[PDB]
Design an enzyme around this catalytic site. Sequence first.
Site, PDB file in Angstrom:
ATOM      1  N   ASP A 153      -7.050  -0.838  -3.380  1.00 17.41           N
ATOM      2  CA  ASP A 153      -6.572  -2.199  -3.599  1.00 17.41           C
ATOM      3  C   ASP A 153      -6.821  -2.675  -5.031  1.00 17.41           C
ATOM      4  O   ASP A 153      -6.230  -3.675  -5.445  1.00 17.41           O
ATOM      5  CB  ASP A 153      -7.245  -3.141  -2.601  1.00 17.41           C
TER       6      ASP A 153
ATOM      7  N   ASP B 248     -33.322 -40.621 -27.769  1.00 13.42           N
ATOM      8  CA  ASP B 248     -33.220 -39.165 -27.823  1.00 13.42           C
ATOM      9  C   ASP B 248     -33.904 -38.511 -26.662  1.00 13.42           C
ATOM     10  O   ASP B 248     -34.029 -37.284 -26.560  1.00 13.42           O
ATOM     11  CB  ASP B 248     -33.803 -38.644 -29.136  1.00 13.42           C
TER      12      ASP B 248
HETATM   13  C1  PMR Z   1      -0.198  -4.044   6.953  1.00 15.05           C
HETATM   14  C2  PMR Z   1      -1.227  -4.802   6.617  1.00 15.05           C
HETATM   15  C3  PMR Z   1      -1.553  -5.115   5.237  1.00 15.05           C
HETATM   16  C4  PMR Z   1      -2.865  -4.996   4.588  1.00 15.05           C
HETATM   17  C5  PMR Z   1      -4.195  -4.555   5.124  1.00 15.05           C
HETATM   18  C6  PMR Z   1      -2.520  -5.452   3.231  1.00 15.05           C
HETATM   19  C7  PMR Z   1      -3.392  -5.559   2.115  1.00 15.05           C
HETATM   20  C8  PMR Z   1      -2.682  -6.014   0.936  1.00 15.05           C
HETATM   21  N1  PMR Z   1      -1.247  -6.268   0.819  1.00 15.05           N
HETATM   22 MG1  PMR Z   1      -0.199  -4.607   1.546  1.00 15.05          MG
HETATM   23  N2  PMR Z   1      -1.106  -5.837   2.959  1.00 15.05           N
HETATM   24  C9  PMR Z   1      -0.576  -5.615   4.271  1.00 15.05           C
HETATM   25  C10 PMR Z   1       0.820  -5.872   4.528  1.00 15.05           C
HETATM   26  C11 PMR Z   1       1.717  -4.984   3.853  1.00 15.05           C
HETATM   27  N3  PMR Z   1       1.658  -5.046   2.414  1.00 15.05           N
HETATM   28  C12 PMR Z   1       2.688  -4.028   2.174  1.00 15.05           C
HETATM   29  C13 PMR Z   1       3.018  -3.761   0.788  1.00 15.05           C
HETATM   30  C14 PMR Z   1       2.540  -4.868  -0.002  1.00 15.05           C
HETATM   31  C15 PMR Z   1       3.320  -5.796  -0.872  1.00 15.05           C
HETATM   32  C16 PMR Z   1       4.736  -6.007  -1.334  1.00 15.05           C
HETATM   33  C17 PMR Z   1       2.226  -6.648  -1.337  1.00 15.05           C
HETATM   34  C18 PMR Z   1       1.062  -6.290  -0.771  1.00 15.05           C
HETATM   35  C19 PMR Z   1      -0.021  -7.097  -1.252  1.00 15.05           C
HETATM   36  C20 PMR Z   1      -1.266  -6.667  -0.600  1.00 15.05           C
HETATM   37  C21 PMR Z   1      -2.592  -6.681  -1.290  1.00 15.05           C
HETATM   38  C22 PMR Z   1      -2.965  -7.014  -2.709  1.00 15.05           C
HETATM   39  C23 PMR Z   1      -2.682  -5.816  -3.629  1.00 15.05           C
HETATM   40  C24 PMR Z   1      -2.033  -4.627  -2.939  1.00 15.05           C
HETATM   41  O1  PMR Z   1      -2.755  -3.777  -2.373  1.00 15.05           O
HETATM   42  O2  PMR Z   1      -0.788  -4.516  -2.963  1.00 15.05           O
HETATM   43  C25 PMR Z   1      -3.502  -6.223  -0.225  1.00 15.05           C
HETATM   44  C26 PMR Z   1      -4.962  -5.974  -0.102  1.00 15.05           C
HETATM   45  C27 PMR Z   1       0.568  -8.118  -2.162  1.00 15.05           C
HETATM   46  C28 PMR Z   1       0.150  -7.892  -3.564  1.00 15.05           C
HETATM   47  O3  PMR Z   1      -0.617  -8.639  -4.125  1.00 15.05           O
HETATM   48  O4  PMR Z   1       0.671  -6.752  -4.295  1.00 15.05           O
HETATM   49  C29 PMR Z   1       0.525  -6.705  -5.712  1.00 15.05           C
HETATM   50  C30 PMR Z   1       2.013  -7.829  -2.178  1.00 15.05           C
HETATM   51  O5  PMR Z   1       2.902  -8.437  -2.873  1.00 15.05           O
HETATM   52  N4  PMR Z   1       1.108  -5.182   0.041  1.00 15.05           N
HETATM   53  C31 PMR Z   1       3.348  -3.395   3.348  1.00 15.05           C
HETATM   54  C32 PMR Z   1       4.420  -2.321   3.318  1.00 15.05           C
HETATM   55  C33 PMR Z   1       5.491  -2.434   4.385  1.00 15.05           C
HETATM   56  C34 PMR Z   1       2.671  -4.039   4.494  1.00 15.05           C
HETATM   57  C35 PMR Z   1       2.886  -3.815   5.967  1.00 15.05           C
END
Ligand code: PMR
Lengths: 401, 403, 429, 420
Positions: D274, D36
Amino acid sequence: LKERGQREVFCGLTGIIWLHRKMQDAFFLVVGSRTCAHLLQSAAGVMIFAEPRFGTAVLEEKDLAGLADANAELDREVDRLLARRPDIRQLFLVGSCPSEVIKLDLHRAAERLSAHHGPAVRVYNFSGSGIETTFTQGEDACLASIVPTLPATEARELLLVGALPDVVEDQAVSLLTQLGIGPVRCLPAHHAAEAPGVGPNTVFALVQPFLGDTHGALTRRGARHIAAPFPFGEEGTTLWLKAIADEFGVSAETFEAVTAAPRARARKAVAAASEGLRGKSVFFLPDSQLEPSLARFLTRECGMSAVEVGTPFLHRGILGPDLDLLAEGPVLSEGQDVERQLDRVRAARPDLTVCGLGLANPLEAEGFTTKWAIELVFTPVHFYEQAGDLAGLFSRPVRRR
Amino acid sequence: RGQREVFCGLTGIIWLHRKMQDAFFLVVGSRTCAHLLQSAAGVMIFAEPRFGTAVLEEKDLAGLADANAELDREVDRLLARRPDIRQLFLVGSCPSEVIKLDLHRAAERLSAHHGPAVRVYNFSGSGIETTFTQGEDACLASIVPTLPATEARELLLVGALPDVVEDQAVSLLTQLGIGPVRCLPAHHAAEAPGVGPNTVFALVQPFLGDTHGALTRRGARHIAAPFPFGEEGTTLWLKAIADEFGVSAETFEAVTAAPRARARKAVAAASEGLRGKSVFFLPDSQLEPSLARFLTRECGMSAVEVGTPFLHRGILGPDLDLLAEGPVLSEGQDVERQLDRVRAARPDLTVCGLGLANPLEAEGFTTKWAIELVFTPVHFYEQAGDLAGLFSRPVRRRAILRR
Amino acid sequence: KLTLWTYEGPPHVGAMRVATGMTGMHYVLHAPQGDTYADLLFTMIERRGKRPPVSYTTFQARDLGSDTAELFQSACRDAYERFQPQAIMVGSSCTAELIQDDTGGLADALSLPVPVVHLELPSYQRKENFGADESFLQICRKLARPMERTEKVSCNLLGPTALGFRHRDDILEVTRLLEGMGIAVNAVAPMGASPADIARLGAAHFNVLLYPETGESAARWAEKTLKQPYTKTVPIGVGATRDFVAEVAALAGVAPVADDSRLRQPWWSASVDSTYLTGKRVFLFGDATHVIAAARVARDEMGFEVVGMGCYNREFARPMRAAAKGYGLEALVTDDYLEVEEAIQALAPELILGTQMERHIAKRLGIPCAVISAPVHVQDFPARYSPQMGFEGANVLFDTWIHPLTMGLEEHLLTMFREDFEFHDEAGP
Amino acid sequence: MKLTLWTYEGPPHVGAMRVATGMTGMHYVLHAPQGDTYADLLFTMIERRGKRPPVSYTTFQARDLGSDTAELFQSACRDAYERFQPQAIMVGSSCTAELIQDDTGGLADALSLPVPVVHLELPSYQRKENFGADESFLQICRKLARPMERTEKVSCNLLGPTALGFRHRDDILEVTRLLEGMGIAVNAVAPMGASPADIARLGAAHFNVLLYPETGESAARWAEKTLKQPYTKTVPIGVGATRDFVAEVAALAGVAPVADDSRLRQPWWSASVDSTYLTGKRVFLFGDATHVIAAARVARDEMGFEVVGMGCYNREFARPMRAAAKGYGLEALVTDDYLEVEEAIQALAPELILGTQMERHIAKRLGIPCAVISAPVHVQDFPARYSPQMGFEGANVLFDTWIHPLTMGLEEHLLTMFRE
Ligand code: PMR
Ligand code: PMR
Ligand SMILES: [Cu+2]
Ligand SMILES: [Cu+2]
């Protein structure tokens, strides 16, 4: 040195942890308190998350006050757990300290339990508690419990006995067939898929040194042990297979030539790590009765210098060939108070220390490298393939400082 | 008039790469445009997408023909790593237009030695000329003239619709009675539809002005109808399509009665959280008027100011006619003065760019990043409740957090 | 050539990285309509409550020739009037370089009372780190001038810039170390600074260089003009922390002390839990300082043997090669990710430590992954206190490095343990 | 008699050993059977302790029964005193010991050693480990914590932090830095950093701080009447709880609040754009009482989550558990069995569950993001990096620790959709 001032070992319930690995058709019901449940849970670690076969029913005050209440609850619980696990057939009612102090007769309970369950599902019990056994004694107690149930066989067959990783068992079978003579029957058969007949005909050899009650179990059948160095390291395995050859009248030239390539690979592997542990001192602590064979392997193959070897109990009758292979250097010892052997450790300045995990970190903080013997039972170190990995487990060329 | 915050036309490339599995997009931008598309949809780049940038060294600027041959060698190299590409797109970056590289003749000479499977299209994604989804508009307008001529009466569905929304659209159109459901943004080049004198098309996304003009040049006639944002707008669209194909009102009612109740219930299921909120708009993707008209009429929101990059009156007309007279339209975007007007209005929710999203929240303004609706399906009946939840999301979080 | 991933972007985003890490500083950039995503990058990754103080011309096709110069003039003047900065920087984008518009003369024509910083940098042959370093040089050259030094010993922290990998906790830990040994921080730049702080910059006695990628040039300029020596050691890991402590004590002339009570990494690596941790090969790719320091702590403290080292900073190629020669390997300096893909396939390491690219390629390859470098996404910037330097930096480093390994060990143990179809009937055939 | 495969706690002697090893100058003698002895493994290794736990075991066997147990116990205590030299000694019993007719208190009295001893009566079959820690704490307090003259400056005592605690090494540091924030000095930190002199001076505080209820509540109540020591009721886990605790301590000590909001970042990052998708996410919480209460409060208020499942294995705190569960309109699940909580998370199917190692692994089986916010943990949960669970820094730690599983699963799903 058999001082009983203070002891630091594990209950034989720690044997259940890897014992169930050999037979996946074995369910273990632990009649133990919360403490034994905590021990099994902690030591298993990630197992409990995968639904093991360890059922550690706590002895509450309710069923501990009386005796027959726990006896009936045992039947109810085993019926429950058979319903949960239809695959399970073999059951083990492992002994535990509360059961021993309350003197619960597990033997009669298991007998009536097997009688009522029937031939399909069979329950044999033993005691793996720390009151009467320790650590590795649980496994040979278990198998000695299932030995009488094994039917007597009238065919002279080479016998392997001892819980062992499946790949090691397969490689041992392959090597003994490469010998050509000697049918192998695995006493810890995988999930009891082949009930191994054991009788006076089958002379046996030993692979796991700690198996003490095993010899008694096989003498009750009439089997005799053959003096053979335990298969640790390339030369240990070589002399072991030589002993098997001698018993079965296999020509020395034939077995020497047959096993040349495997032992060449083994000597390559062991020399890969031998240079790490050259010209150092080691200290052994009583953990799993696996230490004398390790001392022999290290001293003669790895160039180790063994200062002391601590074993909880020496079965000299079977460990005799091991001792003869072992040098006179290291002092043999049957159970040393932990503080006394700690004082000898401090005096000896061991470059490498083999002990339990509990002692390990304090010695590391004191500045001594530690290798915990709780590991080597798990990892495969038992044959030619693992001859090099055995030394690698003790390499530890950390030298960060 | 002043500083604008929009994204140059390469931001469409991200969703056109998904829309056409066959299409690869070679940008010829600098490290600036490559960085734009790289620091964008990070998950896309880790999943081997179909867009890249041909950054041009210093010697490639003075030497026009050297850059031309370099681009040609990149086109030849591309097929080695991806033998699935059958149509190609040399999009126009701002540096390319400044260095006056002619990608039209580049596409011609590249298709000259690529036949018959591989042909390359040229269009501009330059922020100096295009703005956000205007790049989508330009891409579709680029592939329009290459479409074959036909005499068959076909309904064309133009717009980078999500796949599931497209399936719902074609199913509803087929059960209505309108047979042809051909879509210009075809999934594969083998599915490209022919355009002829009797071709009739309906506009899904508002920003497809150039496509509408191009099919008008070919001879295709537009269906003037509200855009598919919410139950009522979709109902008006499907009515207009039924009229253009002569489909009866009875079968239209039989088709559209079932999903209409589900869509209105879904909208109402998120209307309560958003209820009674003033919503400010910033010019992002020219879908603001249709979204505003849905929000106001169906969900019951009092819009303050609607802001769009530019208004195409002819195609967008019915949405403005259905829009309430309260909100004031806005052409152009000076983000400083727009922000000042936002502070003056003090709206409950502000749809704006992500660069302004966090700072607006810091001042205490709930912000909704307008780029969901281009990427996340919000169109037609099933997604009306989804779009409503999109706007109900930020206000609920703002309420829960503070206080 | 064809490009799909860039570790480093245009220099202008680094210039405005320094700008937004700065306070009261406004960057007027000649950019087209659409080169506005860097503000999005900052408000997303850095999660800044204030919009990045960078103005944009955002010219159009119609606005060309004579119109764009007046547009830049207008942008400068309304930025100054609206934001009231105490100084202005002017620069150009990639496209703005192609058109023959001089930002310096346009800014001079305004004659704004606040000082105007002329930022000149090629946009094609350089990278963002060039933008950051040259911006720091310009502000140091203009605003900072030699002057009398503070009576008590003080140090200046140059290198931590915005959008930098774990810089906010970094400066806190380093300031904690200096104050523990008694040295005060006269000014920290570019993070948490003011143009007045840039003026006071030279008042310190000695200087400290945390991020050579963004401060080595400013350190040299301070050494020559301000006569302030700067440290050559970056305290990442216990040994580097001790070396940095000794060096800064020697420079200050005071008694070196350290708070080892907070430190737990040596004991946590001497336990048996790190016995299996010996023998693991680690691939390292990222920025030069981080890669070298990570390799050093991995070889000594972490029980690792480096199998591959690489970077994307052509400026720091020489120190990286010099260090990698010590480890026995050779440097892998490049910006293409096909190269690191091929390298990771050839070496096949057990652990990979790099920026987001390494993380995801490891995920594809089924190899444990960790993040140590600058190019990251929102998830890698934490709200918690996760410094990379000091004794706490060592503990954070150990934790985040062993986290993927213990995750992999746990999942592999679980997978092996409930292994399906356990027959091995060859045993006793 | 119920079959348990994984339990959430240990025998009460485990908690008593926790408090024993926390404070220095103590030695803990078990009347434990041989084997133990494992219980020091977890301390040497899970917590990664460089020193042997201050414990000694008699390790009796089948041959040692009746009188031999008493002689072995006497020898064990004598050698423990002679070679370990503890300033304070205490006598304890194991599960098997009480079944045997071995009087721990009688043996200790017969020893009559000069160092004071206390007899720990541990109902090892009625109760569990946290109770044992608490009982050892109150027993040592009545043994050698006597009332004595107040300190010159207002002083407080942190009661609750024991070894094998969740982050306890970090919570003591964070609370201490905060209290130095108002400038009130901590007279003694027990049992994490206690000593016989520290327990003697424990009565010097002007009030007590209940940093962890399960291990210090009864000690605080004992000080309430024995030493006239008020004890704070609020646990500062989370920003709002931090402010409530700050107000409480400022009231008790009479000093100004002087709270420092400089390092806090969790509210801005939760209100960050975000973080919109976190709203409306169902969460299930299980584990330690105050930990679950604070987790539910933080989730519902500052995280935007909806608490969909609440529970607690600390049965002794089921009343606060039930009160909070009713406050959120939930149904408290007080089971100590992994299978009941397993069924609960199956039926509820929360998006995220935050419990202990059991919850983590069942979520792994169920493909659900998970994080650990409770006591039962493996080795890797205890970090070398300082990770306070409480205070303003603890707010950020809690935030991103909860964020990590969600963003991991989200980006994995984005990858899967994207290569499809
Ligand atoms: C442009 C640069 C950038 C940055 C700083 C983020 C953060 C981010 N990109 Mg947003 N992502 C980028 C890319 C883009 N994503 C865009 C929109 C978008 C989508 C469809 C998505 C996304 C995501 C993200 C995410 C996670 C959550 C969100 O803010 O959407 C961050 C921080 C990701 C997601 O998890 O959405 C639920 C995802 O599917 N973002 C667009 C519009 C044209 C661009 C240019
Ligand atoms: C009761 C003693 C105990 C505890 C608390 C643990 C958990 C634990 N099991 Mg070691 N495990 C114990 C003993 C055993 N564990 C076992 C399983 C196991 C393995 C293979 C290992 C392991 C380890 C651990 C660890 C990591 C700390 C330690 O070293 O004890 C804990 C807490 C880990 C190790 O030893 O360090 C590298 C390791 O390799 N558990 C086995 C089956 C052979 C036994 C008998
Ligand atoms: Cu992970
Ligand atoms: Cu994880």
